[PDB]
């Protein structure tokens, strides 16, 4: 609960801003907002504030919200699969937030029992797969010989404390493929987005991370993964491997910058910018803190006096050997930024 | 309007088991959600119907002791749902599960009376805008703040905030605030029901002699079957919103427990002829939470800043009573029974105590900088308490023995006492709308201040007392 | 039942632990009002770890006593990190114990009225 | 089990006997002692038992013993409920004892379960709340407008290790104003009753506590709530807060006489002799043990060479100022009483 | 522990005792009811030439359905009734597993038509141990010294089937499988083993007052044990080492291994009334005597034997 | 699982070896080695390693390996106590090994609940006591008035994790 599953969702179609008026068609996107169980304002928070960004003028919503008998929380997602899938059938593509699969959860074991259908496991009709299953294998890649069009779909569900193992996370999580854990145990840490490494993966590989994160973010996220023990390991760290600490120090500093959070999307050169000065340690050693000035900062920086830089991965696509020099001559000069 | 066909809407009692009494109408069918007069009677028995069962018979839920009742007892068909006299010529009166005057005063002289069975504000009636409200309340009101017709809701077991914060919220608002105020009472004592009239009498809220009252008191509680606490936060809901709607003003609206309208559930689902669910439950907890809770809330025509509280039944969280609320709480205070043991009040936890209104655009971003702060330090707080150190603190690592500083003079700024604890000490009922927070606490996380004997610091929040209490209970030589 | 021994356990050590844990600051208060006028200028011109490293390297009030005077805090301070780092890393234990509890809690109660009703609800 | 339920229930009910052949009609009570599940031997215990302090003659005992079909374990709770209120509704007073509600709870579930009511948690009938808040509401204070009687009513609940939580004693801890808890857990230790502050309260507040606790008792619960910190604390402080000792030094001192336990009640003016003496820091710094000596003794010192100084409670209605003086070249005296 | 201890008892007691004895095994194995005959007829207890046998046995067992071990621990019940009423006599009787009553109903109440409960059981298992326990009691008549046993199923007493049953024993023994591993026999647990018969006026003063005594530092004990200090003792607060010394001490001078497991060891089943126990464990909270080399004094009781053993196992130079 | 509750059976029935052909008469065992859920190949493993030791020569085994619908995993174990009673009946003695009680608990609460008999706890049958009781009850030692013949039997059991306190275990 209050984690951040619907900014995430919420910058996540926000992004597609650009492309929905842009040159490229085929780099554009229609998003399928999905709500089941919500309060009907807290789904005109989302309509309206959307709207604010005009997001809403290339996105459809659809509610099935609390009053709404059961069953409309169970069509519901059915039903927004069934819009996306006009453009994953017509060359365009869609992106589909289905807000609440565990509502419908909640939501789907009525209609059955009421049918007297022999409940199974914490009510859940033994069909509880087939409910999840049967949906998401609707949101899938369309070869050209088919289309080239596409459905992405983002499944929303509710974390009790911290179990992601349960039944119906199980159901959920045994079929998709890449699961984003959010962390209300981390969240006021700071630690914002709060993604699980290790109990989490983009499981479709560096396939959909393109050469840009394969040159940078490569390293990122495994980095993290055994980093899981160090982290909780070097608070009582003594005399043991002296320059170990590197290892450690890849990941303070670099938190700060991991941790976004704002009503507004980094454009993907722009995530080029900052946090592939991180992979590649130049930052680092800096006392951190004042380091969300600079993933702040260095945006205003970038077009205020380096357009051309952003425009390279237009260009060829990915950091370049010539670019990486111009970076490196604009980060290490943040190193003495606030260095005396 | 009220009225059947050219034919009998006169039902004669079929079967009886407890709460549920089954009626068979003849030549006039009664709809789902219509309330029923039982005739052979020594007083009011409305039964509401529940379901068609088939063989021309309905099946109502019993608002009242189904006590002698015979079958082959006539039930008259009224034609409508439950409804109660909705009006201003209902304030500072007491009104019990039907619209009957409970406070003892007499006949409800009302223009009219609103079906507590209504159609929740639709989607274009909604209203984006979430002005603040202060409470003047540490973690209630900094921490997880609230908002004009936002939602409240505590989480704790059997006594350790709730109706107290219900009251102290009561004090620090109900009191002064524009608009009127409603209390619907479901499930809970009788005791504080009473109390909390004469209390309202003492403090002119409720007034029986001008006409200067500004609250209405609608109960159904725990000596009544299901079928009334299972309405009476309808009614009590069907009051804050006539006075919202038909009467434009921003009501408030106080549920002693507003899932007491589940474990009515939990009382005639199964013997209405339904499949029991987690841990038996119904296969409704859902909708039900749902449907009435989306009732509470705002529109273009009138504000309701409601009050609600959601009991936690075997001190399980993890019991889908509390949580399926959770979705509608514009606020979170989940009290911890281990919290009570440190004697921290109100028992608001540093974690699940979430909200919908805690932007910097609205809360700040220095306080929710130092909010989020508190909480982190308060995180790997949790964590040292016990992992790493095991225990005793002291050990090593200054940078967490900071947070046992730091983060517990924290909980104690949080733990403020108020005025509704009065009777266990007669301490000082610390609160103050923000005010003087500035400084104070953010000299805290910073290191600037802290450092005062620890539990020095304990039983007040303002910094200001430290020193003003370092004289209380010195230390040196 | 059944985890609320594992969660005696802890709780048992909180109180000799999280107390000693203010002693671990006490025992500094009570040394340096003495101590620092003999450092410096002065002169010249469970229980940590600490007592342990100085102690494996062997592979008249002068010394005795001014090594002693700061060998005191040296060796205290495995109360420090006794009642601290073994403090920090142990309660993590209490949230995820009772935490669990609460998951074992509703579980039996969600598992055994699966059993009431497994009979109850089919019959005739 | 076995922790003092009835002891607790037979000195409270026992401690009526002054009143009922004293002056004040209005300082009485009537007893309705319930028992319900009980061996029907138990239940002959307690009969003969108070027989023996003849509280029998001001007391009505109902028994649903086990041999009785579980229906009698289920309307006899109701039927003592209809007992007292005569009294309730007479002026007149009463006080009764609901042996095992949770013993009636065992022995509701079969009532209904045979009469094939679809079961809920724990077998218990859905209505387990309407079972016991429909009685306890009986039990109400009464306004002089409607007669001024009463009726108090103590249930009492088995506790299965500890859990005060389970189902029933949440259904019945969310009804009931004030909850002592009897701990086995402590018992043995000395600390008996052994009531577990933080988890029990009065709840009704200060108002029952009449002015002569509300001038000593006012500190000591509360003394005791944030005290399990420092109790279950110092026994491995150091470095800390030097005089902290104090603190923790009005609890050992003060417990060897907050341990009640023996088959006669102290009288309200006596309970202000002893422990009076306490919370006015005077006994304290001696080395305890020798408390219950005190305890015991000044009762035998007060009837005979004190029989004033609890009259001025029947006088005034609190500690005098003068008595204060009194009772404190007392207690002072006791100091060097053992002390050489 | 459970049918060792009812062997106990009928050693320490069956055998001497007025009036009779009776034994109703329910349930439980076969085996030990052929030797329980056999034994008692070595013992003479059992007589098939004279005429002088006291006790009785009623038997209804495992290789049966379930309408058979419902009824038998009742027949064994009926038969310690008559002896005390018609025949007013002090009976004793002894039910190995007197839930054997409950099993009965786990199988065959739903298959009478019932709707099942707590773990599936019955709407009766109260009523149940209810109606027949109300039994076995005196009256002024007779009396019936009885005996029971109740199991323990899934090592959960959070089961109402020992549990329930508790409201009637006039005595408490719950014997830990965490114990057995700990050795202490009979694994009578210092904590879930009460009484209604155990008041300074009928147990004593100092015996109650060391009782509680022996408790109250088991309890801050049992905390200690791994609380604070962290599994190892030493540590600092010899308050609590003292524990270490006293309460250990003490849970060997409770367990008394007795004649009835002398098929594991042939060791010194330690027993006797009473007599000096008086002065030897008093001793061990107080101080007095309270320091010999810990497991020194394990496999004993009798403070006598700490330096009577002291010799057996020594240590000095 | 995987901890040697096989192998040591089947030492233990491998033992009998000298005996089976021996002098003393009485120092002899015959063996009923039962088998209730296992893959048939898993009893084929064994009838013939012990026939590599010629074990089964002095042995009689008996499957009820996971094909078999439930009812013969469930009679299985009462037939193979009735094998030995030939000799727990005649002088002669026996080793019966049941392979999976347990297994036989899997395969037990099947047959019932099909048969609509209200389950109990985890599903058994509510008689999961006479089931596992009625039969070991049978395994007795006999007098020489009555035989002075035998039956020993090792009922095998599936430890999950560690807990022998389990129902069924219990
Ligand atoms: N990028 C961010 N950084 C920090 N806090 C954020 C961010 N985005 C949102 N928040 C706030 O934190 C909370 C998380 O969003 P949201 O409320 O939708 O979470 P959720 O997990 O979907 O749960 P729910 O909607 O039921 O409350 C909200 O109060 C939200 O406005
Ligand atoms: N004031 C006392 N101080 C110490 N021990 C006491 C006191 N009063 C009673 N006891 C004894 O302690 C036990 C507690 O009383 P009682 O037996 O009625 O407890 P209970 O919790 O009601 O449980 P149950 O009656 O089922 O045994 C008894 O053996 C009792 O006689
Ligand atoms: N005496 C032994 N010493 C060491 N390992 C052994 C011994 N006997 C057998 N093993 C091997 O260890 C495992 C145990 O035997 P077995 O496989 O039959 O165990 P089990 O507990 O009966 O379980 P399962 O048959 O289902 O695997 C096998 O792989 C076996 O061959
Ligand atoms: N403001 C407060 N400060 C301290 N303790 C409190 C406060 N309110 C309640 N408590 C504690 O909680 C107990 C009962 O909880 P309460 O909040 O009154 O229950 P609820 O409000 O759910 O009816 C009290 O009797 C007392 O120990
Ligand atoms: N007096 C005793 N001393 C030591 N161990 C014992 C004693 N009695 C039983 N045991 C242990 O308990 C095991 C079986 O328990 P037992 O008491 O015989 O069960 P029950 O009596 O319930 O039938 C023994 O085989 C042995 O390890
Ligand atoms: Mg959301
Ligand atoms: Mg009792
Ligand atoms: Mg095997």
């Known amino acids: ?89 017509n060359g365009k593509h869609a992106l589909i937030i289905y807000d609440d699969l565990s509502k419908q959860a909640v939501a789907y074991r009525q209609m059955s029992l009421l049918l007297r259908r022999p409940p199974g496991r914490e009510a859940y009709p033994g069909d509880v797969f087939y409910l999840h299953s049967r949906l998401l294998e609707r949101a899938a890649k369309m070869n050209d010989s088919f289309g080239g069009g596409s459905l992405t779909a983002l499944p929303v569900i509710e974390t009790q404390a911290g179990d992601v ?60 993964a055994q980093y899981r023990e160090v982290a909780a390991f070097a608070q009582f760290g003594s005399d043991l491997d002296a320059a170990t600490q590197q290892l450690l120090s890849r990941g303070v500093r670099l938190t700060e910058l991991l941790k976004q959070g704002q009503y507004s999307p980094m454009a993907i050169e722009e995530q080029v910018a900052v946090i592939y000065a991180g992979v590649r340690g130049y930052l680092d050693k800096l006392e951190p803190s004042k380091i969300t000035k600079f993933e702040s900062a260095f945006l205003s920086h970038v077009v205020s006096q380096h357009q051309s830089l952003l425009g390279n991965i237009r260009t060829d696509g990915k950091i370049s050997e010539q670019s990486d020099a111009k970076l490196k001559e604009i980060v290490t000069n943040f190193l003495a930024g606030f260095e005396p | 309007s009220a009225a059947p066909k050219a034919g009998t809407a006169t039902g004669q009692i079929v079967a009886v088991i407890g709460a549920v009494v089954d009626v068979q109408f003849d030549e006039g069918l009664p709809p789902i959600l219509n309330a029923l007069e039982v005739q052979g009677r020594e007083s009011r028995l409305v039964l509401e119907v529940a379901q068609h069962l088939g063989e021309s018979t309905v099946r109502t839920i019993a608002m009242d002791g189904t006590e002698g009742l015979v079958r082959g007892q006539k039930v008259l068909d009224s034609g409508a749902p439950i409804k109660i006299p909705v009006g201003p010529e209902t304030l500072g009166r007491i009104m019990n599960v039907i619209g009957e005057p409970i406070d003892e005063r007499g006949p409800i002289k009302t223009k009219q009376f609103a079906p507590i069975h209504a159609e929740a504000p639709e989607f274009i009636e909604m209203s984006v805008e979430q002005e603040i409200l202060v409470t003047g309340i540490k973690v209630v009101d900094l921490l997880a703040p609230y908002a004009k017709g936002g939602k409240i809701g505590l989480f704790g077991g059997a006594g350790v905030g709730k109706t107290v914060l219900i009251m102290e919220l009561i004090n620090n608002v109900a009191k002064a605030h524009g608009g009127y105020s409603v209390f619907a009472g479901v499930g809970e004592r009788t005791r504080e029901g009473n109390d909390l009239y ?26 009544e079957p299901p079928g009334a606490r299972a309405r009476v936060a309808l009614t009590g809901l069907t009051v804050a919103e006539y006075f919202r709607d038909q009467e434009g003003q921003d009501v408030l609206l106080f549920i002693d ?25 119904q296969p409704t907890l859902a909708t039900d939470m ?4 989306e009732r509470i809330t705002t529109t273009k025509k009138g504000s309701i800043t409601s009050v609600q509280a959601i009991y936690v039944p075997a001190d399980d969280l993890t019991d889908p009573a509390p949580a399926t609320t959770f979705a509608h709480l514009d606020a979170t205070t989940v009290l911890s029974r281990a919290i009570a043991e440190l004697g921290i009040y109100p028992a608001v936890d540093p974690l699940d105590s979430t909200s919908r209104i805690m932007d910097p655009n609205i809360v700040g971003s220095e306080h929710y900088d130092v909010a989020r702060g508190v909480q982190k330090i308060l995180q790997d707080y949790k964590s040292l308490q016990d992992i790493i150190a095991i225990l005793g603190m002291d050990e090593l690592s200054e940078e967490d023995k900071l947070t046992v500083s730091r983060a517990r003079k924290i909980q104690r700024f949080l733990s403020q006492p108020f005025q509704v604890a009065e009777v266990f000490t007669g301490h000082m009922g610390k609160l103050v709308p923000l005010k003087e927070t500035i400084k104070g606490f953010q000299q805290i996380l910073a290191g600037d201040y802290d450092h005062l004997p620890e539990q020095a610091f304990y039983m007040v929040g303002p910094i200001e007392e430290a020193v003003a209490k370092a004289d209380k209970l010195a230390e040196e030589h | 039942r059944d985890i ?11 109180k000799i632990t999280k107390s000693m844990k203010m002693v671990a600051a006490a025992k500094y208060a009570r040394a340096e009002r003495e101590l620092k006028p003999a450092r410096v200028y002065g002169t010249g011109s469970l229980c940590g770890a600490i007592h342990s490293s100085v102690a494996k390297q062997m592979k008249l009030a002068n010394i005795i006593y001014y090594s002693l005077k700061e060998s005191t805090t040296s060796e205290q301070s495995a109360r420090m990190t006794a009642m601290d780092n073994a403090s920090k890393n142990a309660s993590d234990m209490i949230d995820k114990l009772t935490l669990t509890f609460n998951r074992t809690r509703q579980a039996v109660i969600t598992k055994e009225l699966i059993e009431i009703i497994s009979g109850a609800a089919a019959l005739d």
């Open chain 1, 1 to 89: 609960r209050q984690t951040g599953k619907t900014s995430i969702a919420i910058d996540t179609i926000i992004n597609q801003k650009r492309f929905n008026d842009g040159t490229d068609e085929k780099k554009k996107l229609y998003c399928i907002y999905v709500a089941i169980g919500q309060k009907r304002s807290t789904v005109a928070q989302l309509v309206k504030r959307l709207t604010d960004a005009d997001a809403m003028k290339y996105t459809i919503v659809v509610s099935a919200t609390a009053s709404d008998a059961a069953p409309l929380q169970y069509l519901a997602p059915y039903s927004g699969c069934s819009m996306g899938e006009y453009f994953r059938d």
């Open chain 1, 165 to 224: 193992s349960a039944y119906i996370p199980t159901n959920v999580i045994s079929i998709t493929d890449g699961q984003i854990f959010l962390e209300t145990e981390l969240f006021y840490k700071g630690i914002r987005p709060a993604i699980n490494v290790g109990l989490s993966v983009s499981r479709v590989g560096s396939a959909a991370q393109t050469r840009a994160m394969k040159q940078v973010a490569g390293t990122m996220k495994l980095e993290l």
């Open chain 2, 290 to 293: 749902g449907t009435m809770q």
């Open chain 2, 198 to 223: 004469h209390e309202m009498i003492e403090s002119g809220v409720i007034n029986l002699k001008d006409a200067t009252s500004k609250v209405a008191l609608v109960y159904g509680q725990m000596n």
């Open chain 3, 4 to 14: 609320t021994r594992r969660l005696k356990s802890i709780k048992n050590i909180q």
């Open chain 2, 257 to 281: 427990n507003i899932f007491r309208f589940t474990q009515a559930g939990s009382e005639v689902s199964a013997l209405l002829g339904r499949i029991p669910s987690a841990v038996g439950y």
